[PDB]
Amino acid sequence: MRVLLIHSDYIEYEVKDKALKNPEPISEDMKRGRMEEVLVAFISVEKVDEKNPEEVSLKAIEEISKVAEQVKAENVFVYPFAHLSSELAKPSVAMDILNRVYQGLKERGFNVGKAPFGYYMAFKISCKGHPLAELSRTIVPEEARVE
Amino acid sequence: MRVLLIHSDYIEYEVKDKALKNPEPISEDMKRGRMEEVLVAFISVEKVDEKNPEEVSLKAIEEISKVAEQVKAENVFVYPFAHLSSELAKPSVAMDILNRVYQGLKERGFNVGKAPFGYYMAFKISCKGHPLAELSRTIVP
Ligand SMILES: Nc1ncnc2c1ncn2[C@@H]1O[C@H](CO)[C@@H](NC(=O)[C@@H](N)CO)[C@H]1O
Ligand SMILES: Nc1ncnc2c1ncn2[C@@H]1O[C@H](CO)[C@@H](NC(=O)[C@@H](N)CO)[C@H]1O
């Protein structure tokens, strides 16, 4: 998994066109959204993550939470951004992992938001430009899952 | 080299704290900038690129130009974005390669801009959200 963390004044998004034949079923209101003072987690789920969705998600939750703790962010936004990596995981796995990360951050007590999966999407962001407002993290499985 | 290409309605930046002991000296007017209807090239120069700066730069110019034509972008912005890679080239080489890419794109007729090198920088961007508005490329010797 590849994650780009941008501590921003805000994030706005707008669904523009489906990118998959059968994207995530969303309501009209889910097509657009905005969150203030937010640590945006742009995430690309990679092929190697398919080995252990649970472990990778756990590590991602841990890494993202740590950064939020360092920059004092109370709001976190999970944003699908497939082209952060060149070796993408299958859609079904990507969606599952993104959901796991989203739920995990919620469990940690953060106010969490997320954009719909499977779409070409426009977005506006405003990076704060502080030393830790722009970071990258690579997270991968250490062991295959047992299920 | 790791390149993240975002076709945007605009890109704005503001130089803040230095991120290197001795960054690129700049004037007050250079601390801020904006470009519209632009293909933003977020670039991270990698350690392996140090082997052949000219080759990597040439290839980067070719690929970025290709995308610009595909999306019909007349404006291109070279944006230092170190985080895209773990194996970074040393500052002096990284800046030289970014300038080489800048010059190559400028040579081709594009309206090109670039941000100061060696700083933490605030920025505002608006991704168009078209199918080709977000792309990544890996270019190495
Ligand atoms: N491995 C992966 N990691 C993250 N997202 C992935 C994915 N595979 C498929 N997607 C989803 O399908 C859209 C088109 O690739 C993706 N859309 C996007 O990444 C938008 N930013 C495009 O504007 C995303 O919703
Ligand atoms: N290998 C490399 N590739 C691209 N840029 C590099 C670099 N090595 C050093 N820099 C410059 O120094 C700042 C801190 O790494 C970098 N700053 C940035 O990447 C800002 N976006 C941080 O907000 C950049 O100006």
Numbering used by the authors:
A (entry chain B): 1 to 147
B (entry chain A): 1 to 141
Copy out sentences from the published article reporting this entry, exactly as the authors wrote them.
Here we show, with the help of structural, biochemical and biophysical studies from three distant organisms, that the substrate specificity in this domain is determined by a differential remodelling of the catalytic centre at the RNA–protein interface rather than just the presence or absence of catalytic water as previously proposed.
On the other hand, the Lys to Met mutant, although showed partial activity against L-Ser-(Ec)tRNAThr in our earlier work, in subsequent studies with not only PabNTD K121M but also the corresponding K116M and K122M mutants of ApNTD and MjNTD with multiple batches of protein showed a severely compromised activity, suggesting a crucial role of this residue in enzyme function. However, a direct role of Lys in catalysis is still highly unlikely considering that this position is naturally occupied by a Met in the structural homologue DTD. We solved the crystal structure of K121M mutant of PabNTD and K116M mutant of ApNTD with L-Ser3AA and L-Thr3AA to investigate the structural basis of the observed loss of activity. A significant repositioning of the crucial catalytic water was observed upon mutation of the polar Lys side chain to the non-polar Met side chain, which is present in DTD.
